[PDB]
Amino acid sequence: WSLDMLSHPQDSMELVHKQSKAVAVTSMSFPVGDVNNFVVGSEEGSVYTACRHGSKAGISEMFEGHQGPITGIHCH
Amino acid sequence: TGNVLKLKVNFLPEIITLSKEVRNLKWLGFRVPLAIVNKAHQANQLYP
Numbered sequence: 001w002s003l004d005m006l007s008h009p010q011d012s013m014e015l016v017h018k019q020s021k022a023v024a025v026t027s028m029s030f031p032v033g034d035v036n037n038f039v040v041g042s043e044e045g046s047v048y049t050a051c052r053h054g055s056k057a058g059i060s061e062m063f064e065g066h067q068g069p070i071t072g073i074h075c076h
Numbered sequence: 077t078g079n080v081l082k083l084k085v086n087f088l089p090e091i092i093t094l095s096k097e098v099r100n101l102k103w104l105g106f107r108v109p110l111a112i113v114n115k116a117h118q119a120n121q122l123y124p
Contacts, residue, residue, distance in 0.1 A: 020117050020120065020121070021101040021105070021116070021117070021120055022097055022098045022100070022101035022102065022116055022119070022120035022121075023101055023102050024098035024099055024101065024102035025102065026099065026102065042102045042103060043098075043099040043100070043102035043103040044102070044103035044104065046103075069099060069102075
């Protein structure tokens with residue numbers, strides 16, 4: 001959401017498709033050091049590089065690797 | 077004492093179940109029943 005506009009989270013950059021499922025992200029933190037990579041880490045790895053918009057705000061360049069729920073998700 | 081009353085809802089009825097359901101549909105629809113899958117379909121984008 002915007003810094004002044006947070007009456008609803010506007011930029012709903014869903015790091016999933018538009019199907020019918022609770023495709024969650026375990027402890028999906030953004031990248032540490034302000035690299036802004038909102039790593040949406042699903043229950044079976046899939047640490048999606050969920051960004052703001054474009055054709056890369058999700059699981060396109062998924063920086064996964066976690067054997068299980070990718071929870072500690074924050075870059076260097 | 078005094079027959080006073082607070083309020084409550086049914087969102088709290090599946091807190092840990094919603095956490096497990098979110099993780100289940102997060103990976104692939106984990107080892108749960110079919111009714112749990114239908115409940116996940118009717119609750120995933122409906123918990124608001």
